A paper describes a structure:
Thioredoxins (TRX) are small globular proteins of about 100–110 residues, which are conserved in all living organisms. They participate in multiple critical redox-reactions via the reversible oxidation of the active site CXXC catalytic motif1. Two TRX forms were described in Escherichia coli, Trx1 and Trx22. The former, called EcTRX throughout this work, is a widely used experimental model for investigating the molecular basis of protein stability, folding and function.
However, in the E101G mutant, an interesting case of structural variability was observed. In this mutant, an extended, non-sequentially continuous region of the protein backbone presents two alternative traces for only one of two monomers found in the asymmetric unit. The widespread alternative-conformation region involves residues: (i) Asp10 to Val25 (including helix 1 and a half of strand β2) (ii) Thr77 to Val91 (comprising strands β4 and β5); and (iii) Ser95 to Leu107 (involving the complete CTH). Occupancies of these conformations equals 50%, and no clashes or packing defects result when alternatively occupied segments are assigned to different single-conformation models. The RMSD between these alternative conformations is 0.65 Å for the backbone atoms and it occurs without significant changes in the radius of gyration or total accessible surface area (data not shown). Structural differences between these alternative traces are explained mostly through rigid-body displacements of structural elements, as a result of changes in dihedral angles for the first and last residues of each segment. A well-preserved hydrogen bonding pattern is found in the CTH of E101G mutant, even though a Gly residue is highly destabilizing for the α-helical structure. Consistent with our previous report regarding an increase in enzyme activity when assayed using DiFTC-insulin12, the rate constant of E101G reacting with DiFTC-insulin was twice that of wild type EcTRX. Given that a negatively charged residue (Glu) is replaced by a neutral amino acid (Gly), we suspect that this difference in charge may alter the electrostatics of protein-protein interactions modifying in a subtle form the interaction with EcTPx, one of the natural targets of EcTRX, or with the non-natural substrate DiFICT-insulin, and concomitantly the EcTRX activity. The alternative conformation observed for the backbone of the E101G variant conform, to our knowledge, the widest region with alternative traces for the backbone reported to date.
Numbering used by the authors: 1 to 108
């Protein structure tokens, strides 16, 4: 959890929309089973992609305002932003290999 940015509804604009470069945002909640499975994978990816990608999390129970702005209707949802704009998204459980495939297809 040492390389994961903690987001809130209040900080989302500064931390995500005003960040330079690429940021992967995980929308999650404690009641979401697949969210728990992907959490350690996100730590691995935050290290492996350090320098090319920042990884962030937003808990939708505690910060319920942001997900509706992206039409998010299921979790986990991963949003990949580049320079403040969504480039690609993924909904649902995925393996480490699927996550790396998603990132490699969207990051140089
Ligand atoms: Cu960590
Ligand atoms: Cu918090």
């Amino acid at each position: 959890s040492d390389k994961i940015i903690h987001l809130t509804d209040d900080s989302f604009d500064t931390d995500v929309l005003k960040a330079d470069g690429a940021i992967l945002v995980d929308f999650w909640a404690e009641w979401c089973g697949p969210c728990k499975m992907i959490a350690p994978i996100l730590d691995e990816i935050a290290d492996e992609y350090q320098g090319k990608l920042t990884v962030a999390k937003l808990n939708i129970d505690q910060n319920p305002g942001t997900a509706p702005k992206y039409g998010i209707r299921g979790i986990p949802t991963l949003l990949l932003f580049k320079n403040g704009e969504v480039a690609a998204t993924k909904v649902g459980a995925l393996s480490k290999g699927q996550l790396k495939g998603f990132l490699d297809a969207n990051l140089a």
